[model samples]
Target: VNSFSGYLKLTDNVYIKNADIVEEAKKVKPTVVVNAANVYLKHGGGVAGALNKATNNAMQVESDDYIATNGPLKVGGSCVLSGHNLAKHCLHVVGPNVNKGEDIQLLKSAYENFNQHEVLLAPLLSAGIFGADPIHSLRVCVDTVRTNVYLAVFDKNLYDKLVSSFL
Candidate 1:
């Protein structure tokens, strides 16, 4: 929950658990501007990479707070694995889940924020996928949502060519 923050709109009507999607919008405003935490890996709010240290005893990242705020976003199926951020909505497509190709998708998503844009991606690192390890988390799954935007911030024509298949 460092000082870093931003806002994002989900492309698909994806499901999420207990997460403050608006927190990013709150932290950056007035006088200070908080850019992506990735560039500021050395900062307190910044992190290195994704943490692969899930414990068997780890309880699903529950949304007790989320439930308090919006009630259950989804129903029926539930597991500890189901308890992940997926319950929270758009769990960062990170860790081994992301690679260079995904990285490019994120970059493009960021660029899409401009006038010639369709969507804006949420900044990464806050996902908790990346723990204290900066090197491991740097640019990890940073663009999964962003790449879904138009253009090729990461890969030219990829978004347009495989629009349906990509989904």
Candidate 2:
């Protein structure tokens, strides 16, 4: 696989690093870090949980207001917030879960929600508990986003799996 200090390009303008996502996010300092969230924006587990802790749980409060104003977010819808500890902004995307269907349309919508930004730090949104394939998630993100997409992968095994899957 192609490399930039160990980062692999799974697709055009989409790169992944086998490092702590939040730390890499801080270093990259993109305009936004898309947080994989639920309909209520509960930052209690997975990427959302980690980001919530990194931001001192500020995202939770902002997300609450966003949900209240917009109602429970549907799959693909997103809520944007000012960054507290990582990137300049945080974009909350309600992706599919174990219960929801693995639909590329929803993933595409999430990426499109934040496509206006110049640089975005994202993740394999539905590849975790959402039960979608990492390749599929990355493909949808690559196809939907027009700007640079940085995929932060914290798990070494998952990172290796992604690299092997694409290469």
Candidate 3:
């Protein structure tokens, strides 16, 4: 689930890569590192789990506090929190899961959340177990992302899927 050196130039400021997301975020020092999340902000699996560990559970604790105060984050919403590690900040987003319906719009909203930040880093939100098709995820990411963005995928399979249609 790592290390496929696939870098496709989508635009002047956008690129799709098969790289370690945490390492990419650390190297790029993005204004915000987007963590594909659940409404509950649990860092138990997927991108959230990896990011939480990278931050030494600082993001997890912050997530815990955030949820406790604000209640469960609704789908299509996000919040920024301190990274407490190699990265700058974390933007946790409750992205779409196909089981919930209309995953496209919800995923678009999650992608849009990264626009305000100048430099952004993210994994394929709602992809994999979250149920977003890798191609659909890739499309919305490029369509909705603003400023500079480095989109990192975990495995070569999803990377291939995205870059396949990308070609």
Candidate 4:
């Protein structure tokens, strides 16, 4: 298929894939999924937008509802909402924007805040439009996460970079 495929295991509970994280959410049907979200959790684009489309905007509505109830999340902060079609729940974590000197700290904090789902899926948060280095985000995502994580990736270039660096 033209989709994408690659894999690597950094630990017993942490791994990487070259597939779309949102699509992986559909396939694996994990107990929970994570979203690289804005401070307000708008879910307007990228992984969050895809999730909203996949769930027929249910995820977006739920995300807005959550923010209205809990207030907007801060960078490096996180919150939870229903996953709609993808999973039972989603962890919406806000990460540092580009040019932030505290990139690693915020990215690491967001990556580590999983939902404790038995099957967990996450992305290289902030590495996409948020402008963190793919490898840096990948390392932080791999190192700081505490539970089993199926790290689904949407960037083919980053996957090749990982293979060159680690495989």
Candidate 5:
């Protein structure tokens, strides 16, 4: 598969390796900082529960942007809109188990909105969240988001399909 690093600017937006993010932010001194990605809510990931981000119920998985609202917030399904270790708003996307289509739509919405910023750190797309079998999910995402820079994050098999092998 092709790597998307060439196409998109990656950033260490999560709090774990975030000291570096803080340092970089200070040096850059930008007006605002944004974080967008899926929070690994469950410790052990797999196909069974990969797409879900619910704290207690499957229906209410909070987006990464919401959780970034507070720093050191307990990992829950509730929404956090601000005050996290992150400089500003943070968006989190939790895909559903076996819900590839929803995951792609959520990601598309996030990337499209987040792309409006001046400079973007690492904004991870929710790929393979439906488990290691990311081919179909990735294909639909890139296929739909073509020409949008972030579309490159999907797997190659998906890309081929998007291009229409017969073409």
Candidate 6:
């Protein structure tokens, strides 16, 4: 998996897998799971939607107060909500809107905005529904995080494929 060299730079702190994001969420039991969301935090799609479902919509309702008072998070901004049944906390970040100058910069800012924590689980932002390049997005995801980050891979084959190419 030499190809994973760059992606695996923080091996001691990062966990990569092709598994259910929340199922693995159980295993990681991170203190907080960082999820990318629109400023409104509608929980309409992508990771936000899935997490909304997983946490029984509690995250959305809780985050609404923050957004209502704070006036929509700027690109790269974030807020924290009670995780309810899942992780202890949920870090909701405003992902890059694409029109922004650089997605990676926005992504890094979003990650950097969060309060530092011990264990954090984060998925690749702007890669799936946002239509960014997976490899580049993964690189940004892996490289920009300041604290230990759990890189969730939703598909096993994709995980295997990534490693196989390098092996």
Candidate 3 error regions (>4 Å): 1-6, 100-102
* Order of models, best lDDT first: 3, 2, 4, 6, 5, 1
Candidate 4 weakest ten by summed lDDT = 1-10
How well does candidate 5 match the true structure, expressed as C-alpha RMSD?
Answer: 11.1
- Sliding window of 10 residues with minimal summed lDDT for model 6: 1-10
lDDT, candidate 3, 66-88, per-residue tens: 88999998788888888667566
Alpha carbon lDDT of residue 119, candidate 3?
A: 73
Off by over 4 Å in 2: 1-6, 101-104
Q: Which ten residues in a row have the lowest lDDT in candidate 2?
A: 1-10
Q: Please estimate how well model 5 matches the true structure, expressed as its whole-model Cα lDDT.
A: 0.33
Better of 2 and 4 by TM-score: 4
RMSD after CA superposition, every candidate: 14.9, 3.2, 3.8, 3.8, 11.1, 5.0
Please give each candidate's TM-score. 0.20, 0.86, 0.87, 0.87, 0.32, 0.80
Stretches of candidate 5 off by over 4 Å are: 1-80, 93-106, 128-167
Q: Give candidate 4 misplaced runs (Cα > 4 Å).
A: 1-6, 99-103, 115-118
- Candidate 5's clash total is 15
**Tens-digit lDDT track of model 5 for 32-143:** 3333223443323431132222122231233333335543332112222331333343333343334433443444444344434433332234444444234443433334
Candidate 1: residue 114 Cα off by (Å): 18
Q: Kindly list the per-residue Cα lDDT of model 6 for residues 63-145, writing each as its tens digit.
A: 77777888787778877778777688888777686644445567767766543776677776665676565566666655666
Q: Taking the tens digit of each residue's C-alpha lDDT, what string does model 4 give over 1-167?
A: 11223557777667788898877888777677888888787878888788878989887787777778888888888877787778778888888878555556777777767635555778878877787888887777667777777777787887878757752
lDDT of 1 by residue, 46-132 (tens): 111211112121222332333355443211111111212111222222221132223433433332222121232233332233232
lDDT of 6 at 37: 83
- Provide the overall lDDT of each model, using Cα atoms, as 2-decimal numbers: 0.25, 0.76, 0.78, 0.76, 0.33, 0.68
- What count of clashes does model 1 give? 21
